[PDB]
Write a protein that binds this ligand. Sequence first.
Ligand code: B12
Ligand code: B12
Ligand SMILES: [K+]
Ligand SMILES: [K+]
Lengths: 184, 184, 138, 138, 555, 555
Amino acid sequence: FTLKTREGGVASADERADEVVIGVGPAFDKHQHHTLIDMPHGAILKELIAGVEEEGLHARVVRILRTSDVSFMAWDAANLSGSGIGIGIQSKGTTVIHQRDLLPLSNLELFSQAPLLTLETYRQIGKNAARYARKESPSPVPVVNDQMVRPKFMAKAALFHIKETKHVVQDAEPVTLHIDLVRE
Amino acid sequence: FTLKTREGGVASADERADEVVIGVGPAFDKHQHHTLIDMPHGAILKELIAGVEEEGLHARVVRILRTSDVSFMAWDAANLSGSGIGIGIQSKGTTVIHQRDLLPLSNLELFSQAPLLTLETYRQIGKNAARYARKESPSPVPVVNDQMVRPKFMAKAALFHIKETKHVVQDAEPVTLHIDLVRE
Amino acid sequence: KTMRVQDYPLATRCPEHILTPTGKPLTDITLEKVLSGEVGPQDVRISRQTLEYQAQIAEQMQRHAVARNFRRAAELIAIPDERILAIYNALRPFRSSQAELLAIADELEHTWHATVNAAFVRESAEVYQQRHKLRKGS
Amino acid sequence: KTMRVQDYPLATRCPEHILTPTGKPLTDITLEKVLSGEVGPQDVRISRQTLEYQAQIAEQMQRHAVARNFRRAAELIAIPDERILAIYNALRPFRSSQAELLAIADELEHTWHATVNAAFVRESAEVYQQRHKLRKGS
Amino acid sequence: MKRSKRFAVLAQRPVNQDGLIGEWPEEGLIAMDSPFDPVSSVKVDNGLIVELDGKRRDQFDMIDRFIADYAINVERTEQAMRLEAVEIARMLVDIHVSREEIIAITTAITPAKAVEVMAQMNVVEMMMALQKMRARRTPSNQCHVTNLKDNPVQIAADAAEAGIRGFSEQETTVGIARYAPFNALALLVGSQCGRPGVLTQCSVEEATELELGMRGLTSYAETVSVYGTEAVFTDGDDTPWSKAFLASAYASRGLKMRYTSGTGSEALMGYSESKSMLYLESRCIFITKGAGVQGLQNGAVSCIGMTGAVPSGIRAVLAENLIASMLDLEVASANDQTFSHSDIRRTARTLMQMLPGTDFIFSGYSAVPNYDNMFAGSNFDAEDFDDYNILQRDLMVDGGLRPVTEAETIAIRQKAARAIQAVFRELGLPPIADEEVEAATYAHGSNEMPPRNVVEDLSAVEEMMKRNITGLDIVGALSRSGFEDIASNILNMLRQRVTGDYLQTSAILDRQFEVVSAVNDINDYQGPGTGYRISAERWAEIKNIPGVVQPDTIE
Amino acid sequence: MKRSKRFAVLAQRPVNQDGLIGEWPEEGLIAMDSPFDPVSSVKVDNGLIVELDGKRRDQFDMIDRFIADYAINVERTEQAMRLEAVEIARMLVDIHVSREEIIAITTAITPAKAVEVMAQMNVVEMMMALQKMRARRTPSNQCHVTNLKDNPVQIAADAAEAGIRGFSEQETTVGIARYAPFNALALLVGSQCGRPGVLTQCSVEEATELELGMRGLTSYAETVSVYGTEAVFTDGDDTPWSKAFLASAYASRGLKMRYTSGTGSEALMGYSESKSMLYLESRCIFITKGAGVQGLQNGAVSCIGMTGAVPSGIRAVLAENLIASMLDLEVASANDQTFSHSDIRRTARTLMQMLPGTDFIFSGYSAVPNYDNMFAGSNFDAEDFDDYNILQRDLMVDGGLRPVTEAETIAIRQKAARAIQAVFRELGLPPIADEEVEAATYAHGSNEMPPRNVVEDLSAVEEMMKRNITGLDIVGALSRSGFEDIASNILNMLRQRVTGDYLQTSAILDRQFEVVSAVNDINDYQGPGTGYRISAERWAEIKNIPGVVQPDTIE
Ligand code: B12
Ligand code: B12
Ligand SMILES: [K+]
Ligand SMILES: [K+]
């Protein structure tokens, strides 16, 4: 089946100490549907959760609308998670494992090169997170770097970010998104 | 067996019509002994002579002293040859098949990138020369070219030519080179 | 009293005029003393006088903007590092309410005598107010 | 008679004044006259007049050396291509004896009326003799 | 399939992999001179700029206001602004017009005016101008020292090598935030092993970096960012006021710092306000000038992929470097980030700054192979070192780097490795075996480095930061492990804070920790016969490349 | 093993395959400023230069004499020579000094004076100066059109392609000397098929080439060499007089021509007289000036392998271009020969001329893959075309080349291949099969070209020359085979000989066979706001590279 997101209603902070809030960009699995490497948002938004649960936590998905910045996304997500931990991800793919109490531009883990993220990564980003949400010190997802990613994708990342940023709603609160497994 | 040059007397200007004069540089097989790519002068001379004799003509080797320029060396060799066809070669390897009547800087065949010359090519240079001596029209030896030869060898070519040129004797007459077959 | 371009660099031209804000001469900051412990982190810092001297040298090079920054920085020397970080963060977008910025300006002016910084923060309060950079709903 | 910078290019500004050495006007060199055979290779050449004008344009551009080159070349127009090639070759190192070079100068001056080129070659004879570029053996 | 093989070959050339786009001014996707950019203008009413590039003060956003009240000489702007942009442009290349004469004018013009001046110049003119406007007489160079694993041993080693190669500044950053302290620490030790006096920074989140500075784990900061639009500044998590305060905070601790900006950040961050990259950058440059910050790292910098994507982008990068320089700011001119798959293309982009020379030709030449460059790769990296020394020898251009023999490099890398080892031992940090020291000694990148228990490191750092470890603690460790010389070097780097000399424009340090800045090493270019000319000794160093064969020995 | 992987990687760097050598002044293995070079000087006695660079007239060699009596303005040299070299250097970059005022001075100085002026300049200064000294307003480009097999079918096609790419001049040469007439012929036809007005030359032995020109098989000559020492001139088989007469012969036929020189020739040829490469080249430049030759191809040219080997060699190359330009000669500034295995390095060497612009940035850009370049490879070749176009777009620099589509290239190449085919069929020359025409159409190089019967072609060329075939015979052959336009085009190339317009400095032809030279298209640079600035039409062409996607359409 294909993971599809469903626009719920205004989200609220804290909802179980064992929850790792997932904060998707304003256009994720909605106005945009794939990353820079055309990876479907559903499959991604599907791995992030399996990683969560495999460690024994409840993943909750919300749609950040106040901003399109990923660090600020994972922060609002971290400040909506009873575990304090939160995951932020933009439509182009950029992802961040954050934690309330941390400065907005800081983080626990960063995935600053979207085009290099596979599903096994959007998976480990679940396990490690959960490990964090449970006060553990998991070995961070080995960061990956490709010197030609910017030459190839930067311009595109800006284009995708422009699209995502078009749906930012000033001050608007997060909107819980329900998960629907649509029959293949 | 190793081809070894032995200087005799002044080179004659017309020993037989069925010959090809090989004019070697002022330092060839004497002050210098290898090309830019460390190819022994003896084996190259052996290939040239053989190529010519292989065609039924006599290979007469001489040393040009009045110049280190390969065009004039081959030209001199051509004017010394009873067949009108000559071969000129510098210590660095550069070779030309000349013909009397032709302007000094013109030629029948040129091999302007010494580093690319193999003992086999030299064999064909002697054959073609002999073919020209027999007043025939042999298919020119296929020209070879490598865009990186100059970057790799030009400075070295100059150094090699500097040395060879050190032995140029203003107006000195050509010198007969007896071809001694010596043990390797 | 006043420095001249020819007095720079100070470390080489006027060493004696360089003191740590803790009241130790430059010649005191040695490996020996750091080992002995008589010289600590709070000593390896700049004094108001030194920044003033650098401000002078800067403006005499026509770099008034830099000179102004140095003089404003001079006022921040005595403020604890944690408080410096705190004030910086309070200046980041949406962190503070107008009142909180003004209270910070009060602390700066009357508790630290950092009058220029106080004016600087009072300025940020107004700008933030006009450009909506204050904490939402304050 | 005399050209000026604004008369250049001559082909566009003053076509009429452009004549082949054979007397034919520029307008005669067409596919038509070529295919018919009215215009042959000897017509598609520059004339003394033209080079004179180009020289005038050049010198008024402060390019006197170029102007002199053009004027000297103007003298060579009527000389057969084979002779031009032979004289050039005779000028190459060690080709000619001093006498041969002078004889050539005589031909240039009195047969071709190429007075400048005669002087030029006469000059080469002297230079070659002093610098030893004459055929080995006087 | 009757396709042209000529084109098939061309279609396969690396350069065709670069992201190039047509201009889209609406979204700021245009290097310079956008139809939406403002027309230069200023109006002073009672000692207050009340009009700035077509905007009334009542229309000023945070940036306009900050610039108007801090970045422009109000007493001269009206008059200076009456000069045509082409006139100022001529002055920039006019050898009879001094650097100082230009500065008295440029510090009195507006953001729009500055780019308008740039519009009148081709790259040759800009380089001609850049060599005159450069603040420091001798151009220098800054490098990156990082590795995919944030390996302390490799960093120390790489920093030492980067040090002897000639870099005056070294910068590190982390793939994993938490590693920052060890990176700064390692960079600090390695830098002083390679060349006493090398400056080092650890580029992370603002508050986080300042804390590293306050704790003496760095000798300067550079990525103190400013942006061209309020919205981007906001996502940058600052305002011109918090950043100006931040700049002062650094200075109040005697810590050298510069801002960082660069064309393309606003467009890449989604809020270009439909302005050109250069205009927005010009605002950033003025923000930097107004803050009283002595230098700026610009020239697209990390967003080079944005600027290089559009027409005249690389010329715009040179232009932004020039604007900062003519505004009398120290300029760390980028060339620190990858934007092309082509060597021809990336080279042209760098020569723009290298030929004329800037305070720091590269504000981040990668001193490690690009696969280890945690800034996503630099325009030039460790593997380009030989070419770079040959370029200097070819053009008789001082690129700020020198040739080094493998012997001395291995030596310097081992010592640094041992030092960073002696330090971790003295501070009771996760051990650094000889298997790492020796590995980092002969390594090229993190591929030759044995893995390390990361978690056990992220715990030693969190606990090291609780123990309030400072630069002095590092000094002590090096002192108690026989590394007296290095213990001293770090102390002399920290002592820079007390004198305040390296706070001046373009300041760096010689081997004796004596400051060399624009103040005592003033660029004084007035055409041939003046300005920086390579010294006979430096020239000999550039020519002396290992492998250059003495002609008289070729057989 | 105890070896640095860093250095191992560096050792495998292409650039380390480059032939670099230490200087050896005794053998002239030094770019410039040789301790054995003369000190500038001059003395005029009764309208005759009796003293030149520390040499009395009775000490003069052929070169000194020719230079003294033909290359220097005797009536002004004494005064001009009173100027300091650095003062002339300043004038070169001084926006208030016109190229005309400088020319009035340089044409009155000596070979030594010129190099001393260059000694005072860094590369940025020379580029700044070069952009002002360039004679023609709009820079242009020249390419090589050759192939391993001297294949006429491939030559015509490549010429046609090179033509639409923008080259104003095309040059071919041969692997087998006897093939020259066919190469020239094929080049002429192909050139006129790509872009009417494209000038063509066939570089071979002097007398041979003049003959090709007299027979209207070429439209100009360039490799009419001159050398810096008597000995090398001798091995070049000429003297300043035989070459001056030669230049005169060319003009006497209304044939455009320039000389060729270039740093390094004398050293490579063994008789440098212990002088630097630049000093000897300076002599060549003055020989060119004195002969009344309008232009010069220099910048090391074929001997770039020499100049690039030694320190400051690439700077010396830019310097020789500047000297030629400041002496008011048209300059085809090399960049036409390989000297490095590194893209980084070769790019820097070319930017020296490309950025400021010269009459011909490349005096031989290889319009074919280098393996087919019979000049032993050009610094840039057909495979760099996309990179070259992106550079122009990156820097807003007119590189003289524009992008082309596969469709219009296949079409132009096909037409050229058919044209030459028909010319061969008509003239009764060895057949050019449809297989060849088609192969030349989609080929990259001779690797896609079927082998021809060489002996058959050579016999045919001998018979052709014996038959006294001229350009008019080609015209007729084209006319009778349905190529009226190419016939007319070639006829218009020959008509240039009658008007003499393209004999003037820097002269090239527009598509209507109208002359564009320094006379009617003067470069008048006086700084920003003046001189050549890319037209809106040309700039659009530069940035509108095929493949560049419109950003707002991406998903
Ligand atoms: C380009 C770049 C920038 C640009 C563009 C930012 C943007 N939002 O568009 C600029 C210069 C403005 C920027 C700023 C910052 N950056 Co940055 N940035 C990079 C760089 C060199 C390349 C990334 C890339 O181009 N990937 C390719 C494209 C196609 O992938 P992408 O997923 O779409 O890439 C995006 C992310 O990387 C994102 N991003 C960029 N920086 C940061 C920082 C954080 C904390 C987060 C969550 C995301 C993020 O911006 C890219 C474009 O959208 C990386 C190096 C690296 N190792 O990746 C550093 C890097 C990611 N940045 C870093 C930092 C610390 C910052 C700042 C917080 C610095 C400061 N002084 O405030 C600011 C924050 C601004 C913000 N809101 O993101 C660190 C992260 C360290 C960590 N967390 O472990 C890195 C590794 C190194 C460095 N010092 O520059 N950055
Ligand atoms: C560098 C070069 C030059 C230089 C150096 C000459 C020298 N004698 O040192 C200069 C510019 C001065 C030169 C001049 C000439 N050259 Co040249 N030259 C080359 C080039 C581009 C590269 C050769 C190379 O670098 N090889 C690498 C090194 C390591 O190999 P090398 O064997 O040691 O190389 C030597 C030979 O190539 C030799 N050489 C160079 N040119 C010529 C020409 C002839 C006829 C001969 C016999 C030898 C020769 O010089 C090199 C250095 O010693 C070649 C192109 C090619 N396809 O090879 C043309 C080329 C060989 N030259 C050619 C010609 C026609 C000439 C001239 C006659 C031109 C003229 N206007 O007079 C002159 C003659 C001067 C002379 N006495 O050799 C033609 C030959 C055509 C043919 N015969 O089929 C070529 C193929 C193309 C061209 N037009 O440039 N040349
Ligand atoms: K940097
Ligand atoms: K050429």
